Write a protein that binds this ligand. Structure first.
Ligand code: NA
Ligand code: NA
Ligand code: NA
Lengths: 428, 428
């Protein structure tokens, strides 16, 4: 098989770098492992989650860590914070609160199909804030192929494809609004120790910023049992997540209050009888939760082996020849196009550790580089296979490769500017 | 609703015990919480897994532990060892290696129902050694309700219930053969730190004894793509699990070698392409994996609050009036009948910590009490609702409540003897 070969080619690459690199043995091991994992996660020869499990087993066998020490990475408080958003979404999905949120809004439009399509994007993004991106796309597709029925002029495409590629992008942009939504966001918060309210001040403005800018580029070319309870619980959870900073301070200063709030939601949602656990066990993408830990284990492997300081010293002369503007532009541009070839989270899981640890060796706040990479990782708009939402609206057998390949080439450059701009403002 | 009320009745008990117990505050807090959790797990008003999530959220808010410290319990090496058994079982199910194991063996018997039923039990038990009990029961029922078709005379029931209640029991006995199989086994190994080969020396001999003794009580009343590969990995894995003790010693002494082996299997099964990850995500009962951590968190809560030594001192005069024979007999008997009313795994999560920690307060190796409790938890034979296998062969609308209610009531007494005997032999 194709992927079965990438594994063997990666094993050879490891042995080569392991035996031939003329550096301190630990740096060789750290460099070799980093290259190994990098391939397995970008090519996906092995499932993103399978590669994550391979990270600790390597560090353990090569004396980097002891068994239990390596496994402990998979229990970060952020992982449970994301699991709360899964049970929170599963709750209002099993309850049907996502469809009713679409009807009451889609029906808010009197009957104008012209202004209806615009409302389809705003919901896909708002739903992605709490549910997901692949799921938000798969859930919106049937609701998109429903409005398109009064006038199905398949020959008329400048009024037809715009609505499909829009939701595939609104789902990806909506996931950049909150810590929950896209896995990459969680990987950043877990690396630097961000709170939920910390990441919303960053991403939400960008989501508010990037959504209109994205549409412009395309343009110019019944309340039943405890649905108020689900809303009450949901509203209460989001309220604490925003006000977690002062609430926790005025309670004794609990460590990971955002995580505590997320777990309480699972309790209220289960106490309120509104969602059964078998529902939560299905909605939660346990493979992604394992990926979170796998990325942290790799990050710690870089530190314990000194690969972070070895690469920081190697890039010392290059980053000094560049300004802070030049750096974040190369990074932003590098990822904005890299995420087009590989999975969103698979890209973030690899770059967030490398950059955050090297930036930490430079005595620089790793928040900037980390949050930036997490946002640009969700900027896959060209060809499909970049993000499932892209292949979801792409599976409609209508949108052309070259059409999307060039509309995304415009949006990509557009985002690199918006990101580098906002990234420079969030400095002093 | 009933369960929503059972929760409120338990909430009152906690508040009552909280303010009224006249002991040191820590003991009061530990005592109050222990009673609270005990109810939620035996009645199952909230899903066993939902109750597990409630354990840490309490310890954090009541100052027992800090957030991250509590969550780390959910990453114990045994949990990942059990996750390996899930991907190992999920592999041979999607591949069909379990079906061929039944035919090639069931076909060894030419057509004699006498040796067919006996082979039906031996396979149901051997399959439970590695897969599960609920899954093994659901997988055997069609093969049991297919052989019992030539003798369909539901008027002839003593030749029909024997084969349904027989496999429903053989599936439960098979789960006592290896560390993987029944959650209770893992809870014991995690408390006292048992290896895979350690628990097999305990359970497997007991399984060899209990299977014939169980039948006597009932009596006296094509290899395609890589199906050998699935066996090769399985065979190789089980070979390492057995010889794990010398292999690790001859490699540098890794900490949790058994856990590493389970994770390595997940890699081979994914590298060999024999099972996709989406397959593993279905089979694994993540709710049980979350339960594992909740049970360990409780064990440490008893120590940190001194409840383990507090109960040991309270039982000092009582345990001195009793011999070691009385102890292991009282314990075994209590659970063998307790598991008839509540979930099997939920019971072990409650009693294993209490006894192992109290036994530790008595300065006694908790291995004996832990392994003992873990074995008796899988002895549910009376009414249904005790174990899914009971309600699985009972949902066949043929086996009578009184029929099973008394065959298990007799089989229960039979086990209490065998266990207390072996528990005395496994002493010195
Ligand atoms: Na991507
Ligand atoms: Na089993
Ligand atoms: Na039970």
């Amino acid at each position: 098989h194709r992927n079965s070969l990438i594994v063997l080619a990666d094993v050879a690459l490891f042995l080569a770098l392991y035996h031939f690199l003329p550096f301190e043995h630990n740096v060789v091991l750290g460099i070799s492992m980093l290259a190994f994992i990098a391939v397995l996660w970008l090519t996906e020869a092995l499932h993103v989650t399978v590669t994550a499990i391979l990270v600790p087993v390597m560090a353990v066998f090569f004396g980097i860590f002891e068994t239990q020490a390596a496994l402990n990475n998979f229990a970060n408080s952020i992982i449970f914070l994301f699991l709360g958003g899964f049970a929170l979404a599963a709750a209002m999905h099993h309850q049907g609160l996502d469809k009713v949120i679409a009807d009451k809004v889609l029906a808010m439009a009197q009957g104008k199909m012209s202004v209806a399509v615009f409302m389809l994007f705003g919901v896909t993004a708002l739903l992605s804030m709490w549910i997901s991106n692949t799921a938000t796309a798969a859930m919106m597709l049937p609701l998109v192929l429903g409005v398109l029925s009064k006038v199905d002029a398949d020959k008329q495409r400048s009024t037809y494809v715009f609505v499909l590629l829009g939701v595939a992008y609104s789902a990806s942009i909506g996931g950049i609004a909150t810590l929950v939504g896209s896995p990459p966001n969680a990987i950043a918060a877990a690396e630097v120790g961000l709170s939920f309210t910390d990441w919303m001040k960053f991403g939400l403005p960008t989501a508010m910023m990037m959504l209109p800018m994205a549409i412009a580029i395309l343009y110019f070319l019944n309340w039943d049992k405890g649905k108020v309870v689900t809303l009450g619980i949901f509203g209460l959870t989001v309220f604490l997540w925003i006000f977690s900073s002062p609430i926790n301070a005025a309670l004794g200063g609990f460590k990971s209050f955002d995580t505590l709030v997320a777990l309480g939601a699972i309790l209220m949602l289960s106490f309120a009888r509104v969602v059964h656990w078998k529902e939560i066990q299905k909605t939660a993408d346990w493979g992604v939760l394992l990926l979170f830990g796998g990325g942290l284990c790799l990050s710690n492997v870089l530190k314990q082996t000194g690969t972070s300081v070895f690469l920081a010293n190697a890039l010392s002369d290059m980053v000094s020849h560049m300004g802070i503007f030049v750096v974040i532009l190369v990074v932003a541009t590098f990822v904005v196009f890299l995420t087009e070839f590989a999975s969103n989270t698979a890209s973030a899981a690899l770059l967030i550790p490398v950059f955050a640890t090297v930036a930490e060796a430079f005595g620089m706040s790793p928040v900037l580089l980390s949050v930036l990479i997490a946002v640009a990782a969700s900027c896959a708009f060209m060809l499909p296979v970049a993000t499932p939402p892209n292949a979801i609206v792409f599976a409609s057998g209508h949108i052309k490769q070259s059409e999307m390949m060039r509309v995304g080439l415009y949006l990509n450059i557009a985002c690199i500017g918006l990101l580098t701009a906002i990234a420079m403002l969030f400095w002093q």
